[PDB]
Amino acid sequence: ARCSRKALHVNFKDMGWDDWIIAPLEYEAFHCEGLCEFPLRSHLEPTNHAVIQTLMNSMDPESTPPTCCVPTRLSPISILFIDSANNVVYKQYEDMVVESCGCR
Amino acid sequence: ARCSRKALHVNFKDMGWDDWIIAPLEYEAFHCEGLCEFPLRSHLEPTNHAVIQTLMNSMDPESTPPTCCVPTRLSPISILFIDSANNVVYKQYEDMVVESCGCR
């Protein structure tokens, strides 16, 4: 029920890249989901702003919304593909995999 | 209706710091609120992960939730107060004011 890391299975075979992409054709990206409320566990590593927002939402939920569960650390993946010129490319893309979730 | 920066007026006079805090007694923190969906305007500066999540939510909203509107840049404020030893302290606190919002 609380802010945590749940799966997200990304299938590049929908993407329409079939003539070009070699690997990976699928990868585990994860996503962040769940309530952001007291108590803010230490792994949510809340900013000062998030603590203050969470407090205000707790004192009067009509005035102020809760913070939100989102990725706080992400990591790259690399994709092996053939380009138009027919070169074999292996390229790193940043921010592809959620490594940690947090309330923000 | 879209992910943008709305006000949040923080009143330190609830906080129970009255014997100690000199200034500021109030500050504008802002908060992030609103829908995260195509089109992702350039100011939301979406990560690769957020674009992919947004696409998956668009193809099948039952499977995958939308990303979330959150602070992407924050700035400090400084607080002037008297400590227990009766010293006048002026301390910077990080991540107090939302400077920009984004979909994550």
Short mmCIF file of N, CA and C in Angstrom, two decimals, chain A:
data_model
loop_
_atom_site.label_atom_id
_atom_site.label_comp_id
_atom_site.label_asym_id
_atom_site.label_seq_id
_atom_site.Cartn_x
_atom_site.Cartn_y
_atom_site.Cartn_z
N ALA A 1 0.86 -1.25 0.00
CA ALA A 1 0.00 0.00 0.00
C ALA A 1 0.87 1.27 0.00
N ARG A 2 2.12 1.13 0.49
CA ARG A 2 2.99 2.29 0.65
C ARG A 2 3.89 2.54 -0.56
N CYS A 3 4.40 3.76 -0.72
CA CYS A 3 5.36 4.06 -1.79
C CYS A 3 6.41 2.93 -1.86
N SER A 4 6.41 2.12 -2.95
CA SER A 4 7.47 1.15 -3.17
C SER A 4 7.67 0.86 -4.65
N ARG A 5 8.63 -0.01 -4.94
CA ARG A 5 9.04 -0.24 -6.36
C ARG A 5 8.32 -1.48 -6.85
N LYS A 6 7.50 -1.31 -7.89
CA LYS A 6 6.78 -2.43 -8.43
C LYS A 6 7.35 -2.66 -9.81
N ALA A 7 7.01 -3.79 -10.40
CA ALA A 7 7.54 -4.07 -11.72
C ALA A 7 6.93 -3.15 -12.83
N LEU A 8 7.77 -2.99 -13.89
CA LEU A 8 7.29 -2.60 -15.22
C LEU A 8 8.13 -3.30 -16.31
N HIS A 9 7.49 -4.23 -17.03
CA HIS A 9 8.12 -5.02 -18.11
C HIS A 9 7.94 -4.32 -19.49
N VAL A 10 9.03 -3.74 -20.02
CA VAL A 10 8.98 -2.93 -21.23
C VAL A 10 9.28 -3.84 -22.43
N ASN A 11 8.34 -3.93 -23.36
CA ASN A 11 8.50 -4.75 -24.57
C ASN A 11 8.82 -3.90 -25.82
N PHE A 12 10.08 -3.88 -26.24
CA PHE A 12 10.48 -3.09 -27.40
C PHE A 12 9.90 -3.60 -28.72
N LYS A 13 9.26 -4.78 -28.69
CA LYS A 13 8.70 -5.39 -29.90
C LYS A 13 7.36 -4.79 -30.31
N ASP A 14 6.81 -3.91 -29.48
CA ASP A 14 5.66 -3.11 -29.88
C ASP A 14 6.21 -1.92 -30.67
N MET A 15 7.30 -1.37 -30.12
CA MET A 15 7.95 -0.13 -30.54
C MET A 15 8.07 0.13 -32.04
N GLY A 16 8.10 -0.93 -32.84
CA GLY A 16 8.19 -0.79 -34.28
C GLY A 16 9.63 -0.60 -34.70
N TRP A 17 10.53 -1.29 -34.01
CA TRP A 17 11.96 -1.17 -34.26
C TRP A 17 12.57 -2.46 -34.81
N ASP A 18 11.72 -3.34 -35.34
CA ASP A 18 12.11 -4.74 -35.53
C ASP A 18 13.23 -4.94 -36.53
N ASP A 19 13.24 -4.12 -37.58
CA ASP A 19 14.33 -4.15 -38.53
C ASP A 19 15.66 -3.64 -37.96
N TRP A 20 15.62 -2.97 -36.80
CA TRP A 20 16.84 -2.35 -36.31
C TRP A 20 17.37 -2.91 -34.99
N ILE A 21 16.50 -3.19 -34.03
CA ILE A 21 16.97 -3.53 -32.69
C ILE A 21 17.43 -5.00 -32.52
N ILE A 22 18.62 -5.19 -31.99
CA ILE A 22 19.11 -6.53 -31.77
C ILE A 22 18.81 -6.99 -30.34
N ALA A 23 19.24 -6.21 -29.36
CA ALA A 23 19.05 -6.59 -27.97
C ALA A 23 19.20 -5.35 -27.13
N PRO A 24 18.52 -5.24 -25.98
CA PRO A 24 17.52 -6.21 -25.53
C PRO A 24 16.17 -5.95 -26.19
N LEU A 25 15.34 -6.96 -26.32
CA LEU A 25 14.05 -6.75 -26.92
C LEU A 25 13.03 -6.50 -25.83
N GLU A 26 13.43 -6.75 -24.60
CA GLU A 26 12.59 -6.51 -23.44
C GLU A 26 13.51 -6.16 -22.28
N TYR A 27 13.02 -5.33 -21.37
CA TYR A 27 13.75 -5.07 -20.12
C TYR A 27 12.82 -4.67 -18.97
N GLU A 28 13.31 -4.89 -17.76
CA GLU A 28 12.58 -4.56 -16.55
C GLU A 28 12.90 -3.10 -16.13
N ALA A 29 11.93 -2.20 -16.31
CA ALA A 29 12.15 -0.79 -15.99
C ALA A 29 11.74 -0.43 -14.57
N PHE A 30 10.80 -1.19 -14.01
CA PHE A 30 10.14 -0.82 -12.74
C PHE A 30 9.33 0.50 -12.81
N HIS A 31 8.47 0.69 -11.82
CA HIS A 31 7.77 1.95 -11.60
C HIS A 31 7.44 2.11 -10.11
N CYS A 32 7.16 3.35 -9.73
CA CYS A 32 6.92 3.72 -8.34
C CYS A 32 5.45 3.93 -8.14
N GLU A 33 4.93 3.38 -7.05
CA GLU A 33 3.52 3.41 -6.80
C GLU A 33 3.29 3.33 -5.29
N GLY A 34 2.32 4.08 -4.79
CA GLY A 34 1.83 3.88 -3.44
C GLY A 34 1.75 5.16 -2.64
N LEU A 35 1.13 5.06 -1.46
CA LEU A 35 0.86 6.21 -0.61
C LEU A 35 2.12 6.89 -0.07
N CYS A 36 2.02 8.20 0.07
CA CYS A 36 3.10 9.00 0.61
C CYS A 36 2.61 9.72 1.83
N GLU A 37 2.80 9.11 2.98
CA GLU A 37 2.27 9.70 4.17
C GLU A 37 3.10 9.28 5.36
N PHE A 38 2.92 10.00 6.46
CA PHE A 38 3.54 9.60 7.70
C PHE A 38 3.14 8.11 7.94
N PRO A 39 4.09 7.25 8.32
CA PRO A 39 5.48 7.71 8.52
C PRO A 39 6.28 7.60 7.27
N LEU A 40 7.12 8.60 7.04
CA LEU A 40 8.03 8.55 5.93
C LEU A 40 9.26 7.73 6.32
N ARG A 41 9.27 6.48 5.87
CA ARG A 41 10.39 5.59 6.14
C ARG A 41 11.68 6.17 5.57
N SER A 42 12.80 5.86 6.23
CA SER A 42 14.09 6.43 5.82
C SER A 42 14.47 6.15 4.36
N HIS A 43 13.99 5.02 3.80
CA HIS A 43 14.30 4.69 2.41
C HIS A 43 13.56 5.57 1.38
N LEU A 44 12.53 6.28 1.82
CA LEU A 44 11.90 7.24 0.93
C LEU A 44 12.75 8.52 0.79
N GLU A 45 13.80 8.63 1.60
CA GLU A 45 14.72 9.79 1.69
C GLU A 45 14.07 11.14 1.35
N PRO A 46 13.06 11.53 2.11
CA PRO A 46 12.28 12.71 1.77
C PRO A 46 13.15 13.98 1.83
N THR A 47 12.92 14.91 0.92
CA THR A 47 13.52 16.23 1.02
C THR A 47 12.83 16.98 2.15
N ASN A 48 13.44 18.07 2.61
CA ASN A 48 12.78 18.98 3.55
C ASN A 48 11.44 19.43 3.04
N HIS A 49 11.37 19.79 1.76
CA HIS A 49 10.12 20.22 1.15
C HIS A 49 9.04 19.15 1.26
N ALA A 50 9.39 17.90 0.99
CA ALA A 50 8.42 16.80 1.09
C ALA A 50 7.91 16.55 2.52
N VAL A 51 8.78 16.68 3.52
CA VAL A 51 8.35 16.54 4.91
C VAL A 51 7.32 17.62 5.24
N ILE A 52 7.62 18.86 4.86
CA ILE A 52 6.76 20.00 5.10
C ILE A 52 5.43 19.87 4.38
N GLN A 53 5.47 19.48 3.11
CA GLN A 53 4.23 19.21 2.39
C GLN A 53 3.42 18.08 3.01
N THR A 54 4.09 17.02 3.43
CA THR A 54 3.39 15.90 4.03
C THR A 54 2.71 16.36 5.33
N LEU A 55 3.38 17.23 6.08
CA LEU A 55 2.84 17.70 7.37
C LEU A 55 1.60 18.55 7.11
N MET A 56 1.70 19.47 6.17
CA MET A 56 0.58 20.33 5.83
C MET A 56 -0.63 19.55 5.33
N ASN A 57 -0.41 18.56 4.47
CA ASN A 57 -1.48 17.65 4.04
C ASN A 57 -2.10 16.91 5.21
N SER A 58 -1.29 16.57 6.21
CA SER A 58 -1.79 15.86 7.39
C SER A 58 -2.61 16.75 8.30
N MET A 59 -2.17 17.99 8.47
CA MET A 59 -2.93 18.94 9.27
C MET A 59 -4.25 19.33 8.59
N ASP A 60 -4.25 19.53 7.27
CA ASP A 60 -5.48 19.95 6.57
C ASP A 60 -5.48 19.52 5.09
N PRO A 61 -5.92 18.25 4.86
CA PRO A 61 -5.84 17.61 3.53
C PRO A 61 -6.60 18.33 2.43
N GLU A 62 -7.54 19.19 2.83
CA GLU A 62 -8.30 20.00 1.89
C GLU A 62 -7.42 21.08 1.25
N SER A 63 -6.57 21.70 2.07
CA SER A 63 -5.68 22.76 1.61
C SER A 63 -4.56 22.25 0.71
N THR A 64 -3.86 21.22 1.19
CA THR A 64 -2.61 20.73 0.59
C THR A 64 -2.63 19.25 0.20
N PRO A 65 -2.33 18.92 -1.05
CA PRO A 65 -2.25 17.52 -1.46
C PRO A 65 -1.01 16.81 -0.91
N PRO A 66 -1.04 15.48 -0.90
CA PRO A 66 0.13 14.69 -0.49
C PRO A 66 1.22 14.79 -1.52
N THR A 67 2.45 14.50 -1.10
CA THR A 67 3.51 14.35 -2.05
C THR A 67 3.27 13.07 -2.84
N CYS A 68 4.18 12.81 -3.76
CA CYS A 68 4.01 11.73 -4.68
C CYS A 68 5.18 10.76 -4.74
N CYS A 69 4.85 9.49 -4.97
CA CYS A 69 5.82 8.41 -5.05
C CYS A 69 6.48 8.37 -6.43
N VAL A 70 7.78 8.63 -6.52
CA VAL A 70 8.48 8.72 -7.80
C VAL A 70 9.90 8.16 -7.76
N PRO A 71 10.52 7.89 -8.91
CA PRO A 71 11.90 7.42 -8.92
C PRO A 71 12.86 8.46 -8.41
N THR A 72 13.76 8.10 -7.50
CA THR A 72 14.77 9.04 -7.01
C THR A 72 16.17 8.69 -7.51
N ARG A 73 16.35 7.46 -7.96
CA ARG A 73 17.60 7.05 -8.59
C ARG A 73 17.27 6.24 -9.81
N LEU A 74 17.90 6.55 -10.93
CA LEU A 74 17.72 5.74 -12.11
C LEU A 74 19.05 5.33 -12.69
N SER A 75 19.04 4.26 -13.46
CA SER A 75 20.28 3.79 -14.08
C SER A 75 20.11 3.56 -15.59
N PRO A 76 21.21 3.58 -16.34
CA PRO A 76 21.10 3.45 -17.80
C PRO A 76 20.89 2.02 -18.25
N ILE A 77 20.45 1.84 -19.49
CA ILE A 77 20.68 0.59 -20.19
C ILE A 77 21.30 0.89 -21.53
N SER A 78 21.88 -0.15 -22.13
CA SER A 78 22.48 -0.03 -23.43
C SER A 78 21.69 -0.84 -24.45
N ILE A 79 21.54 -0.30 -25.66
CA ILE A 79 20.80 -0.98 -26.70
C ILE A 79 21.64 -1.26 -27.94
N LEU A 80 21.62 -2.51 -28.38
CA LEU A 80 22.37 -2.93 -29.55
C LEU A 80 21.44 -2.94 -30.73
N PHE A 81 21.77 -2.14 -31.75
CA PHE A 81 20.93 -2.04 -32.94
C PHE A 81 21.73 -1.72 -34.19
N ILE A 82 21.09 -1.94 -35.33
CA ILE A 82 21.61 -1.59 -36.63
C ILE A 82 21.01 -0.25 -37.04
N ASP A 83 21.82 0.72 -37.44
CA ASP A 83 21.27 1.98 -37.90
C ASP A 83 20.94 1.92 -39.40
N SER A 84 20.47 3.03 -39.97
CA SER A 84 20.12 3.11 -41.40
C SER A 84 21.31 2.83 -42.33
N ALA A 85 22.48 3.35 -41.96
CA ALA A 85 23.71 3.12 -42.72
C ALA A 85 24.20 1.68 -42.59
N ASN A 86 23.53 0.89 -41.75
CA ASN A 86 23.88 -0.51 -41.60
C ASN A 86 25.10 -0.74 -40.70
N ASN A 87 25.37 0.23 -39.84
CA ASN A 87 26.39 0.11 -38.81
C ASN A 87 25.77 -0.55 -37.59
N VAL A 88 26.56 -1.38 -36.90
CA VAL A 88 26.15 -1.93 -35.61
C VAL A 88 26.52 -0.98 -34.50
N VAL A 89 25.50 -0.44 -33.85
CA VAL A 89 25.66 0.55 -32.81
C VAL A 89 25.29 -0.05 -31.46
N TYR A 90 25.99 0.36 -30.42
CA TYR A 90 25.66 -0.05 -29.07
C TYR A 90 25.65 1.20 -28.24
N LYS A 91 24.44 1.68 -27.93
CA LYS A 91 24.26 3.00 -27.33
C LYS A 91 23.64 2.97 -25.93
N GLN A 92 24.21 3.77 -25.05
CA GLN A 92 23.68 3.89 -23.70
C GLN A 92 22.60 4.96 -23.64
N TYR A 93 21.49 4.60 -23.01
CA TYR A 93 20.42 5.54 -22.75
C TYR A 93 20.31 5.74 -21.26
N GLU A 94 20.36 7.00 -20.82
CA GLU A 94 20.23 7.31 -19.40
C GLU A 94 18.79 7.17 -18.90
N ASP A 95 18.64 6.97 -17.59
CA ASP A 95 17.35 7.05 -16.89
C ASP A 95 16.33 6.06 -17.40
N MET A 96 16.73 4.80 -17.51
CA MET A 96 15.86 3.79 -18.07
C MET A 96 15.27 2.86 -17.02
N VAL A 97 15.99 2.64 -15.93
CA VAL A 97 15.60 1.65 -14.94
C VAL A 97 15.49 2.35 -13.59
N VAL A 98 14.36 2.19 -12.91
CA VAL A 98 14.19 2.74 -11.58
C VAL A 98 15.02 1.93 -10.59
N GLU A 99 15.93 2.58 -9.87
CA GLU A 99 16.69 1.88 -8.83
C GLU A 99 16.14 2.11 -7.43
N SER A 100 15.55 3.28 -7.20
CA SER A 100 14.93 3.57 -5.91
C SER A 100 13.75 4.53 -6.06
N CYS A 101 12.78 4.37 -5.16
CA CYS A 101 11.56 5.18 -5.11
C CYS A 101 11.60 6.10 -3.89
N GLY A 102 10.85 7.19 -3.96
CA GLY A 102 10.81 8.12 -2.85
C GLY A 102 9.62 9.03 -2.97
N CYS A 103 9.32 9.72 -1.88
CA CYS A 103 8.18 10.61 -1.81
C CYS A 103 8.69 12.01 -2.08
N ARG A 104 8.09 12.69 -3.05
CA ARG A 104 8.57 14.00 -3.49
C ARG A 104 7.47 15.04 -3.73
#
